[PDB]
């Protein structure tokens, strides 16, 4: 009921500290920000990178291999978001994201941040989008557990898969191919 | 790039019962009181005083001595502040501060968000990153982190904020290091310069 | 006019073989052995010193250094041009404006004549630099008190932070500049007593 | 036939350090708490707390008297037009600064390299600066009793010379130039 999406990371949107794999599937972090041009599409403050392809309508889904990562946040964002200074990643600011911080605190990046009580920490999360209905939901791609879903909102403009990592840990954030 | 801000108070902004020093780098509350004209550029009901220089970008920080002072509240506020009346100095009104009350430290200066500090602070730092909504406070004894306020979307210029509810002892603002500025350096150099 | 709290990071290419730097390059120890490293023209070979990375040629800058439990140390500013090889004295004529602890005393300009009569033991020392003023000062960061300002010098060239570790007891910590909650999630209740690595 | 030309020296506000305060008659000099917001034109001493006169000397012998009074810190004299004004330089004849003065209210010094410690019998309340461009003389006297204070080693003067005044301290007594 949701079209599988072949998502790849767009390095030109990557924060100067984020490392995009050669296949544009894995996402790591460096010790310090890299000397890269500050093109208007690149994220400068938030440790965020987008996909290469957007979604203007339909029902799409992709699965993210979060693995052992003790910090990660995934979701979607409007194209008209601010990428050069700090914005509170919130549906009001065009950000529909969930994730994990500190290895145990699962939260939905809303305002206020909704504290999720995940029974079993997911090793692979599935992001589900539904433009015309305004539904953003995240599931445990392994055992199908519903993690969280955002309230219905009327989407404006295109949507891009957004990925944010803050820590420098061994295990990387990889996107599962479709 | 971090800026070691040299914060001097603005007597316009100051309160009619706070008494600034001549350098305007210290403030104290005594029995006598000013009776200065309550213009729109100043505070009247709640004891407050602001720094003249207001920031609109970059990273800035400054230190403040509060040794042997009972009740104080240091932090950062906007330049588009409310200056008349007695509203709550809570992030919703544009005031992010760190305070002491009842021998306790409270974040956001609201009674239930109390900080669990294991030692009394004699000199605190006030950090500000404009492009990050970052307003942080530091324990300058070990340069350790104390508290970072909930990240605020900054509209216009902000400026240093100071509030003294303690009559006992003055609140000192640490000036930026000036080296040997305005002072003759002998052939052997200055040794343990004081004043 | 404006003071810049510097974020100093050591340069391992200038680090004496007996100097062991941390992964963040913000602290250094004197190891029991040598590292068997190349003797590149940037590295000190006889005196145990290491410089900061970014150099200064104008403006006001300062950095704090934790020197607690270090018996023989020397810190300050030096010229980018100073000779790395040899055992030349760390004096202003050779391009070194330094504050030193030697023989359980404090010596300015690394001179036995200029003993500093401090009665408090230094734990965190701030190194002040004002290029246009020829000013190299030092401060006791416990009370933000003044220690010593070196004789005014026409610098004429880029200047770099200078560090000499002479003991094997305890490391030399170069305090990084405050970065607030950079790269850290501030919870809805605010970030309380952050301790990082 | 005249012995010298008495100089009617008035302070040039366009050269004064942003921390200095020039009077309305341009005769008195005072300091401020912090620097003013004045443009950093080339003629302004941005680092040293110095100020120049308005007219220079290309030749001849000139003399003027400066009232120092109870001031605990002051330094006066002449200097070349090509002196360094935007950063610190040691005010010595080597750098084009012929200056003497008082520091800490008691230590009189001729600002040479190294500074010369002066022994002053009677603290001068009014100092006279004598300049002889032809013989390279820069001389300082006690204007009240005419007694000599200090004379710099005679030099070959290059370029015009300016009356320069330097004060580092804020105090009630001001550095005042006495009119011709
Ligand atoms: C450090 C950083 C973002 C942290 O943002 P926040 O501090 O607002 O925390 P969160 O509510 O999880 O978004 C760069 O992406
Ligand atoms: C602070 C200052 C000048 C101090 O210069 P110096 O440090 O060379 O001292 P002095 O020998 O009296 O000239 C500004 O005029």
Author numbering:
A (entry chain D): 336 to 513
B (entry chain B): 325 to 519
C (entry chain A): 324 to 520
D (entry chain C): 334 to 513
What did the study's authors say about this model?
Here we show how—in both humans and alpaca—multiple pAgs function as ‘molecular glues’ to promote heteromeric association between the intracellular domains of BTN3A1 and the structurally similar butyrophilin BTN2A1. The BTN3A1–pAg complex functions as a composite interface that directly binds to BTN2A1, bridged by the pAg molecule at the centre of the interface.
We observed a similar molecular glue behaviour of pAgs in alpacas (Vicugna pacos, Vp), to our knowledge the first non-primate species known to have a pAg-reactive Vγ9Vδ2 T cell subset. Among these, VpBTN3 accommodates pAgs and is required for γδ T cell activation. HMBPP, DMAPP and IPP (in order of activity) promote the association between the VpBTN3 butyrophilin full intracellular domain (BFI) and VpBTN2 BFI, but not with the VpBTN1 BFI. A structural analysis revealed that VpBTN2, resembling human BTN2A1, shares conserved residues (such as Arg475, Thr508 and Val509) that are essential for pAg-induced association with BTN3A1. A VpBTN2 BFI variant with mutations in these key residues abolishes its binding affinity for VpBTN3 BFI in the presence of HMBPP. Thus, in both humans and alpacas, structurally diverse pAgs function as molecular glues, enabling the formation of a composite interface between butyrophilins.
